[PDB]
Nucleic acid binder design. Structure first.
Ligand SMILES: [Zn+2]
Length: 634
RNA sequence: GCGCGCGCGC
RNA sequence: GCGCGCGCGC
């Protein structure tokens, strides 16, 4: 892909120009236009421009590991013939290697930003002056408390409170600078100017002179929005909902306080949030004596899940599909395993089968949205018949529902659906597709194409039109500030930077006063006493452990199938409340400096005042202001 | 374990 | 800000 002798399009040269002039630039161009190659050009010119005797140093920031890897590879291959030493550092590297010496012995360093934040903090890397060029990938993240913005806080602290050493050139790559919570074009302009100030950029580089050349290869689908209406009378949903109430009551019979077993609140039937609730409930009940209870509970939650699925299918396909799904499920349950609970469940289902059948086959309960879909399909194909279509639905079951519905629609006899001899690809998640339809879907980021958005929800339409308006404000604002003289703009930016810096330095949180009184840490679920706060030690300023052998007998440990390591310790296992019927998630168990020690999260605990009985809940240790004692190998 | 960003609700 | 959820990082 990015590995063949790339020959530049004119727009890439145009984009590369201001950066090669030494200007701090935000390069803004669509996804897949070759901003990476542009960055290669800029890096090449930058390194090559130094007179013999001098040498530059370039750091490229990547936010995700895959990007880190792919650009490490690309950069390593591109500057092969040049002789430049190319390396990279990620959380998989450090802390295994001495970073300062790596940065010193290399010319092109690909980094995840948090590495650099860490090494600026610890002072291992003293100044950003060892770099002559910085490249930020996805530079629009340079805002708020993002690592990019921290690095740039270091940069700007060096620039404003002036400091002897030279600052590197800063380059940013993005496809959209964003507008934040802008409602007016002026607020958009202010936001964009703020982003430019955060990156110390004086130029926004967009394609202007070679726009035609760009648009000729950019996926810009014709956006179509179609608001559809849903059924007024749905008795199917009423019935299934009653079944689900029955099942949840049955579940509460074997698990009181099921209502406080998950943190997900105000669940509703036939939603993805309910699905998530099922997931968390099954999670918070892993399958001695408690395992039986959890197995029963598992059966109940499984059936609830099937019911939820069916409700969704009924919402977006036809009742027949939902009932068919349910019938396959219950047939399968009847087949491979007869249990008391299960047979009871299928039995409670079969007492409702006939009424469900009647509501299903009722032609007044048919789904109006499918008519709209059908008509869109007809209209699009009865024009261009060699049309290949991709259709996005929101569940795996809705795929099969839609497919069955298509293959059984006389008005759609010309279609051959698939999940070359396939006209329609129906799917859930993932350019050469000339027809895209988002049939009630939850995202179009990836030679005459259009995109349809079918939904019964008006808020989705609203959201989309809002997004488009924001796009327009963004582009207009960018043109506007591109008109300005660079010096005026630099003055403005400078004083924005001064303002922001002052705000940062002033709004430092005043150091908190700790209540040095000893308090109780109880299990949040079962309320059993886990420990006391005086046995608690802070590790690496952000992590919390408990001392003593007394605590070792208060938690059981289950081995982590994903033993990942960080720049501090290795997550070996997870820990739980040792009461053999609670088993609440308490945190993890780590290997830290050859020590095998527990690390706990305050969100799994209640803080009780000993003298009283006053309890308090904390989600973050940072908000729990008690006497925080440092850890010590003793 | 902690940190960062986004979405939804109040 | 709080709650919930998703995504990413050390
Ligand atoms: Zn417990």
């Amino acid at each position: 892909n990015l590995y063949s002798p790339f020959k530049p399009r004119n727009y890439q040269l145009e984009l590369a120009l201001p950066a090669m002039k030494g200007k701090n630039t935000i390069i803004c161009a669509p996804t897949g236009c070759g901003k990476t190659f542009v960055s290669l050009l800029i890096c090449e010119h930058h390194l090559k421009k130094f007179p013999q005797g001098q040498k530059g140093k370039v750091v490229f920031f990547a936010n995700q590991i895959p990007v880190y890897e792919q650009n490490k590879s690309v950069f390593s291959k591109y500057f092969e013939r040049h002789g430049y030493r190319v390396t990279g550092i990620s959380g998989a590297t450090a802390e295994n290697v001495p970073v300062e010496q790596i940065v010193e012995n290399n010319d092109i360093i690909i980094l995840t930003p948090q590495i650099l934040v860490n090494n600026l903090k610890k002072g291992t890397i003293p100044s950003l002056s060892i770099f002559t060029l910085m490249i930020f990938d996805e530079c629009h993240n340079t805002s708020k408390q993002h690592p990019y913005n921290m690095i740039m806080f270091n940069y700007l602290d060096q620039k404003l409170g002036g400091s002897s050493g030279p600052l590197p050139q800063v380059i940013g790559l993005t496809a959209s600078v964003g507008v934040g919570d802008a409602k007016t074009t002026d607020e958009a302009l202010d936001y964009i100017c703020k982003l430019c100030a955060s990156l110390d950029a004086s130029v926004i580089a967009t394609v202007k002179h070679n726009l035609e050349e760009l648009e000729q290869v950019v996926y810009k689908p014709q956006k179509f929005f179609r608001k559809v209406e849903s059924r007024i009378s749905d008795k199917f949903k009423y019935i299934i909902a009653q079944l689900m109430r029955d099942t949840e009551s049955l579940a509460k019979r074997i698990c009181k306080d099921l209502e406080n077993l998950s943190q997900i609140q105000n669940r509703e039937f036939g939603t993805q949030k309910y699905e998530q609730w099922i997931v968390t409930v099954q999670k918070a009940c892993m399958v001695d004596e408690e395992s039986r209870i959890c197995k029963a509970l598992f059966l109940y939650t499984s059936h609830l899940r099937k019911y939820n699925d069916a409700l969704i299918i009924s919402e977006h396909a036809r009742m027949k599909d939902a009932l068919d799904y349910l019938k396959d499920f219950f047939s399968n349950v009847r087949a491979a395993g007869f249990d008391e609970i299960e047979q009871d469940l299928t039995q409670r289902f079969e007492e409702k089968l006939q009424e469900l059948e009647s509501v299903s086959r009722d032609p007044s309960n048919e789904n109006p949205k499918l008519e709209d879909l059908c008509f869109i399909l007809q209209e699009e194909y009865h024009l261009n018949p060699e049309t290949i279509t991709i259709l996005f639905v929101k569940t795996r079951a809705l795929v099969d529902a839609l497919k069955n519905w298509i293959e059984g629609n006389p008005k759609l006899s010309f279609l051959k659906p698939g999940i070359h001899n396939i006209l329609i690809a129906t799917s859930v998640a993932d350019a050469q597709c000339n027809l895209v339809i988002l049939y009630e879907y939850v995202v179009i980021k990836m030679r005459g194409s259009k995109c349809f958005l079918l939904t019964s929800n008006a808020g989705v339409i609203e959201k989309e039109q809002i997004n488009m308006y924001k796009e327009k404000m963004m582009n207009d604002s960018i043109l506007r500030l591109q008109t300005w003289d660079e010096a005026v703009f630099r003055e403005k930016i400078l004083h924005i930077q001064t303002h922001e810096k002052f705000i940062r330095d002033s709004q430092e949180k005043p150091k908190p006063v700790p209540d040095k009184e000893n308090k109780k840490l109880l299990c949040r679920k079962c309320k059993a006493l886990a420990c006391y706060t005086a046995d608690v030690r802070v590790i690496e300023d952000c992590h919390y452990t408990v001392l003593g052998d007394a605590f070792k007998e208060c938690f059981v440990s289950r081995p982590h199938p994903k033993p990942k390591q960080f720049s501090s310790f290795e997550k070996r296992a997870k820990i739980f409340c040792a009461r053999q019927n609670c088993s609440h998630d308490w945190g993890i168990h780590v290997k830290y400096k050859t020590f095998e020690i527990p690390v706990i999260k305050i969100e799994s605990f209640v803080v009780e005042d000993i003298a009283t009985g006053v309890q308090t809940l904390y989600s973050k240790w940072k908000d729990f202001h008690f006497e925080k004692i440092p850890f010590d190998p003793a």
